[PDB]
Short mmCIF file of all heavy atoms in Angstrom, two decimals:
data_model
loop_
_atom_site.label_atom_id
_atom_site.label_comp_id
_atom_site.label_asym_id
_atom_site.label_seq_id
_atom_site.Cartn_x
_atom_site.Cartn_y
_atom_site.Cartn_z
N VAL B 25 8.49 5.50 21.79
CA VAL B 25 9.83 6.00 21.49
C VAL B 25 9.73 7.52 21.17
O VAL B 25 8.78 7.94 20.61
CB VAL B 25 10.37 5.12 20.32
CG1 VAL B 25 11.95 5.40 20.19
CG2 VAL B 25 10.17 3.66 20.51
N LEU B 26 10.79 8.21 21.51
CA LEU B 26 10.90 9.62 21.08
C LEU B 26 12.28 9.68 20.46
O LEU B 26 13.27 10.16 21.18
CB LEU B 26 10.71 10.56 22.27
CG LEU B 26 9.35 10.83 22.80
CD1 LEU B 26 8.71 9.56 23.50
CD2 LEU B 26 9.27 12.03 23.69
N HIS B 27 12.46 9.47 19.24
CA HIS B 27 13.70 9.63 18.60
C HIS B 27 13.79 10.96 17.91
O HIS B 27 12.90 11.28 17.12
CB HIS B 27 13.89 8.53 17.52
CG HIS B 27 12.78 8.36 16.61
ND1 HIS B 27 12.58 9.26 15.54
CD2 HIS B 27 11.84 7.42 16.41
CE1 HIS B 27 11.56 8.92 14.82
NE2 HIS B 27 11.08 7.84 15.31
N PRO B 28 14.83 11.72 18.12
CA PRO B 28 14.88 13.14 17.66
C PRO B 28 15.24 13.20 16.14
O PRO B 28 15.55 14.24 15.67
CB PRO B 28 16.03 13.77 18.53
CG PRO B 28 16.92 12.62 18.72
CD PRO B 28 16.12 11.39 18.82
N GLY B 29 15.06 12.12 15.46
CA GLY B 29 15.38 11.95 14.03
C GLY B 29 16.53 11.02 13.80
O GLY B 29 17.68 11.36 13.89
N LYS B 30 16.11 9.83 13.42
CA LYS B 30 17.06 8.72 13.26
C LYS B 30 16.21 7.65 12.45
O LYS B 30 15.16 7.99 11.89
CB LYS B 30 17.58 8.13 14.59
CG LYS B 30 18.84 8.74 15.00
CD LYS B 30 19.52 7.96 16.15
CE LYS B 30 20.71 8.69 16.73
NZ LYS B 30 20.29 9.86 17.46
N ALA B 31 16.77 6.42 12.40
CA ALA B 31 16.13 5.43 11.55
C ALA B 31 15.11 4.59 12.39
O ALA B 31 15.11 3.25 12.14
CB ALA B 31 17.18 4.56 10.92
N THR B 32 14.43 5.07 13.39
CA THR B 32 13.41 4.26 14.12
C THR B 32 14.03 3.06 14.80
O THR B 32 13.82 1.93 14.35
CB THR B 32 12.22 3.93 13.19
OG1 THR B 32 11.82 5.10 12.45
CG2 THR B 32 11.05 3.41 14.09
N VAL B 33 14.77 3.36 15.85
CA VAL B 33 15.80 2.50 16.41
C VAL B 33 15.33 1.03 16.43
O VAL B 33 14.11 0.76 16.76
CB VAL B 33 16.12 2.93 17.87
CG1 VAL B 33 16.93 4.15 17.80
CG2 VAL B 33 14.84 3.21 18.60
N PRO B 34 16.12 0.09 16.11
CA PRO B 34 15.71 -1.33 15.80
C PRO B 34 15.20 -2.00 17.09
O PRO B 34 15.20 -1.44 18.24
CB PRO B 34 16.97 -2.02 15.39
CG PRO B 34 17.89 -0.97 14.96
CD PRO B 34 17.58 0.26 15.81
N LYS B 35 14.57 -3.15 16.91
CA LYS B 35 14.11 -3.95 18.05
C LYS B 35 15.13 -4.33 19.00
O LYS B 35 14.86 -4.56 20.19
CB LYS B 35 13.32 -5.12 17.47
CG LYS B 35 11.84 -4.85 17.14
CD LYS B 35 11.18 -6.03 16.47
CE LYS B 35 11.65 -6.23 15.09
NZ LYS B 35 11.58 -4.90 14.34
N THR B 36 16.37 -4.47 18.53
CA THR B 36 17.50 -4.94 19.38
C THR B 36 17.76 -3.88 20.52
O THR B 36 17.82 -4.20 21.71
CB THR B 36 18.73 -5.17 18.58
OG1 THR B 36 18.50 -6.17 17.55
CG2 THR B 36 19.82 -5.70 19.49
N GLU B 37 17.96 -2.58 20.12
CA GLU B 37 18.25 -1.61 21.03
C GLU B 37 17.18 -1.30 22.08
O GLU B 37 17.37 -1.21 23.26
CB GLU B 37 18.59 -0.30 20.39
CG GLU B 37 19.94 -0.37 19.61
CD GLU B 37 20.45 1.04 19.16
OE1 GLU B 37 19.59 1.81 18.76
OE2 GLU B 37 21.66 1.31 19.31
N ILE B 38 15.93 -1.31 21.56
CA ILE B 38 14.81 -0.93 22.41
C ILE B 38 14.60 -2.12 23.41
O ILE B 38 14.15 -1.90 24.53
CB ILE B 38 13.57 -0.63 21.60
CG1 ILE B 38 12.44 -0.11 22.45
CG2 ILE B 38 13.08 -1.89 20.82
CD1 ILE B 38 11.35 0.48 21.64
N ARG B 39 14.81 -3.34 23.00
CA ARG B 39 14.86 -4.46 23.91
C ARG B 39 16.00 -4.30 24.92
O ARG B 39 15.88 -4.68 26.10
CB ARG B 39 14.99 -5.79 23.13
CG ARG B 39 14.32 -6.93 23.79
CD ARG B 39 14.84 -8.29 23.25
NE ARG B 39 14.74 -8.33 21.77
CZ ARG B 39 14.92 -9.44 21.05
NH1 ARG B 39 15.27 -10.55 21.63
NH2 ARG B 39 14.80 -9.38 19.72
N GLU B 40 17.13 -3.74 24.46
CA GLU B 40 18.24 -3.60 25.36
C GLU B 40 18.00 -2.52 26.36
O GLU B 40 18.10 -2.71 27.64
CB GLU B 40 19.55 -3.21 24.57
CG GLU B 40 20.64 -2.67 25.47
CD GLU B 40 21.38 -3.75 26.20
OE1 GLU B 40 21.60 -4.80 25.55
OE2 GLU B 40 21.74 -3.53 27.35
N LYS B 41 17.49 -1.38 25.99
CA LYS B 41 17.24 -0.20 26.91
C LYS B 41 16.07 -0.50 27.86
O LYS B 41 16.10 -0.20 29.05
CB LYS B 41 16.92 1.02 26.12
CG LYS B 41 18.09 1.71 25.53
CD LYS B 41 17.72 3.04 24.80
CE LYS B 41 17.11 3.97 25.77
NZ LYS B 41 18.03 4.54 26.79
N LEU B 42 15.01 -1.16 27.37
CA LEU B 42 13.88 -1.30 28.18
C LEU B 42 14.13 -2.08 29.41
O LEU B 42 13.59 -1.85 30.56
CB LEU B 42 12.73 -2.05 27.36
CG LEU B 42 11.39 -2.27 28.05
CD1 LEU B 42 10.84 -0.91 28.36
CD2 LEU B 42 10.46 -2.99 27.16
N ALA B 43 15.10 -3.14 29.40
CA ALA B 43 15.43 -3.94 30.46
C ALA B 43 16.04 -3.09 31.59
O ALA B 43 15.77 -3.31 32.76
CB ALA B 43 16.41 -5.03 30.05
N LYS B 44 16.90 -2.14 31.15
CA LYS B 44 17.54 -1.30 32.22
C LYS B 44 16.54 -0.45 32.97
O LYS B 44 16.73 -0.18 34.19
CB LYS B 44 18.55 -0.36 31.54
CG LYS B 44 19.81 -1.11 31.01
CD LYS B 44 20.79 -0.09 30.39
CE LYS B 44 21.96 -0.85 29.84
NZ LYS B 44 21.66 -1.69 28.70
N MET B 45 15.39 -0.20 32.39
CA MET B 45 14.34 0.56 33.05
C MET B 45 13.45 -0.40 33.78
O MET B 45 12.56 -0.03 34.52
CB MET B 45 13.55 1.36 32.07
CG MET B 45 14.35 2.24 31.13
SD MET B 45 13.65 3.81 30.72
CE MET B 45 14.93 4.50 29.68
N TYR B 46 13.63 -1.75 33.63
CA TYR B 46 12.75 -2.73 34.18
C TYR B 46 13.51 -3.76 35.00
O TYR B 46 12.92 -4.60 35.66
CB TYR B 46 11.94 -3.47 33.09
CG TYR B 46 10.59 -2.76 32.82
CD1 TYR B 46 10.29 -2.37 31.62
CD2 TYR B 46 9.75 -2.46 33.90
CE1 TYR B 46 9.13 -1.69 31.30
CE2 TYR B 46 8.51 -1.79 33.58
CZ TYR B 46 8.25 -1.42 32.34
OH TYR B 46 7.03 -0.82 32.06
N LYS B 47 14.87 -3.66 34.99
CA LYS B 47 15.72 -4.50 35.83
C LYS B 47 15.58 -6.01 35.55
O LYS B 47 15.19 -6.77 36.38
CB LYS B 47 15.46 -4.22 37.32
CG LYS B 47 16.09 -2.88 37.80
CD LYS B 47 14.98 -1.77 37.78
CE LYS B 47 15.53 -0.53 38.47
NZ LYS B 47 14.56 0.58 38.42
N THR B 48 15.88 -6.33 34.27
CA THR B 48 15.79 -7.74 33.87
C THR B 48 16.66 -7.99 32.65
O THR B 48 17.52 -7.16 32.26
CB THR B 48 14.33 -8.16 33.52
OG1 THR B 48 14.24 -9.55 33.28
CG2 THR B 48 13.78 -7.40 32.39
N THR B 49 16.55 -9.15 32.11
CA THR B 49 17.40 -9.65 30.97
C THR B 49 16.75 -9.22 29.63
O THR B 49 15.56 -9.04 29.53
CB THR B 49 17.53 -11.18 31.09
OG1 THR B 49 18.55 -11.59 30.12
CG2 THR B 49 16.23 -11.79 30.75
N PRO B 50 17.57 -9.10 28.57
CA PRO B 50 16.97 -8.95 27.24
C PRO B 50 16.49 -10.26 26.61
O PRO B 50 16.16 -10.22 25.43
CB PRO B 50 18.09 -8.31 26.42
CG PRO B 50 19.35 -8.55 27.20
CD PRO B 50 19.00 -9.11 28.58
N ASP B 51 16.48 -11.32 27.41
CA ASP B 51 15.96 -12.54 26.82
C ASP B 51 14.43 -12.64 26.98
O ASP B 51 13.72 -13.16 26.13
CB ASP B 51 16.52 -13.77 27.67
CG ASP B 51 15.97 -15.10 27.16
OD1 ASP B 51 15.40 -15.22 26.07
OD2 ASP B 51 16.27 -16.14 27.82
N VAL B 52 13.85 -11.93 27.95
CA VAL B 52 12.41 -12.02 28.30
C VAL B 52 11.63 -10.88 27.64
O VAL B 52 10.39 -11.11 27.55
CB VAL B 52 12.26 -11.93 29.87
CG1 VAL B 52 12.72 -10.61 30.37
CG2 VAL B 52 10.86 -12.28 30.23
N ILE B 53 12.27 -9.79 27.25
CA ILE B 53 11.55 -8.67 26.68
C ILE B 53 11.29 -8.97 25.17
O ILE B 53 12.20 -9.29 24.46
CB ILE B 53 12.43 -7.44 26.74
CG1 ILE B 53 12.60 -7.04 28.27
CG2 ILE B 53 11.73 -6.27 26.09
CD1 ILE B 53 13.20 -5.71 28.41
N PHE B 54 10.03 -8.88 24.75
CA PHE B 54 9.65 -9.03 23.38
C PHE B 54 8.72 -7.90 22.96
O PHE B 54 7.80 -7.69 23.62
CB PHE B 54 9.09 -10.35 23.11
CG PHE B 54 10.05 -11.56 23.21
CD1 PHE B 54 10.20 -12.21 24.42
CD2 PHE B 54 10.81 -11.98 22.16
CE1 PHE B 54 11.02 -13.25 24.59
CE2 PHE B 54 11.70 -12.96 22.27
CZ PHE B 54 11.78 -13.65 23.48
N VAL B 55 9.10 -7.25 21.85
CA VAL B 55 8.34 -6.16 21.31
C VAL B 55 7.90 -6.46 19.92
O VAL B 55 8.32 -7.28 19.26
CB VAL B 55 9.11 -4.86 21.29
CG1 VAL B 55 9.41 -4.41 22.75
CG2 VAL B 55 10.42 -5.01 20.53
N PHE B 56 6.74 -5.71 19.49
CA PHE B 56 6.18 -5.98 18.22
C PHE B 56 5.41 -4.78 17.78
O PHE B 56 4.74 -4.14 18.54
CB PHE B 56 5.28 -7.18 18.25
CG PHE B 56 4.08 -7.00 19.20
CD1 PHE B 56 2.79 -6.51 18.72
CD2 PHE B 56 4.18 -7.37 20.50
CE1 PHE B 56 1.77 -6.37 19.53
CE2 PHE B 56 3.07 -7.16 21.38
CZ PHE B 56 1.83 -6.65 20.87
N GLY B 57 5.51 -4.40 16.47
CA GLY B 57 4.72 -3.40 15.82
C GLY B 57 5.04 -1.96 16.13
O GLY B 57 4.24 -1.26 16.65
N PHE B 58 6.19 -1.52 15.60
CA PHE B 58 6.59 -0.15 15.68
C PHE B 58 6.05 0.49 14.36
O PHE B 58 6.58 0.21 13.33
CB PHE B 58 8.10 0.06 15.85
CG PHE B 58 8.62 -0.53 17.06
CD1 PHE B 58 9.37 -1.71 17.02
CD2 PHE B 58 8.51 -0.01 18.29
CE1 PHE B 58 9.95 -2.28 18.18
CE2 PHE B 58 8.96 -0.49 19.38
CZ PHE B 58 9.65 -1.69 19.40
N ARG B 59 5.10 1.49 14.56
CA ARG B 59 4.55 2.16 13.37
C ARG B 59 4.81 3.71 13.62
O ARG B 59 4.12 4.36 14.24
CB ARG B 59 3.03 1.89 13.26
CG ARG B 59 2.71 0.64 12.54
CD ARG B 59 2.63 0.80 11.09
NE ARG B 59 3.81 0.85 10.39
CZ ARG B 59 4.09 1.18 9.14
NH1 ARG B 59 2.96 1.35 8.36
NH2 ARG B 59 5.24 1.29 8.64
N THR B 60 5.91 4.17 13.01
CA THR B 60 6.32 5.56 13.16
C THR B 60 5.33 6.47 12.67
O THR B 60 4.60 6.23 11.68
CB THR B 60 7.71 5.76 12.53
OG1 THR B 60 8.00 7.24 12.64
CG2 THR B 60 7.66 5.44 11.07
N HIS B 61 5.30 7.65 13.24
CA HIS B 61 4.36 8.73 12.82
C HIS B 61 5.03 9.55 11.78
O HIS B 61 6.14 9.37 11.36
CB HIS B 61 4.03 9.59 14.00
CG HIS B 61 3.31 8.88 15.15
ND1 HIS B 61 3.44 9.18 16.45
CD2 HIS B 61 2.48 7.78 15.12
CE1 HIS B 61 2.77 8.38 17.23
NE2 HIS B 61 2.23 7.50 16.43
N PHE B 62 4.27 10.56 11.27
CA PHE B 62 4.75 11.42 10.24
C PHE B 62 5.66 12.47 10.81
O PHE B 62 5.35 13.08 11.89
CB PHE B 62 3.62 12.06 9.35
CG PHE B 62 4.12 12.74 8.21
CD1 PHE B 62 4.21 12.09 7.03
CD2 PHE B 62 4.40 14.09 8.26
CE1 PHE B 62 4.69 12.80 5.95
CE2 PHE B 62 4.85 14.80 7.13
CZ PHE B 62 4.99 14.12 5.98
#
Side-chain angles (χ1 to χ4, degrees):
Chain B
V25 194
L26 283 72
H27 53 74
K30 266 193 192 70
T32 311
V33 287
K35 273 173 287 310
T36 303
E37 291 193 316
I38 190 166
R39 212 198 306 191
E40 168 76 40
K41 281 182 61 68
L42 183 63
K44 294 181 176 67
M45 312 215 178
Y46 272 125
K47 284 98 172 177
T48 185
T49 191
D51 183 10
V52 65
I53 297 190
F54 291 93
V55 291
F56 64 93
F58 300 107
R59 279 270 76 186
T60 175
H61 301 148
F62 190 90

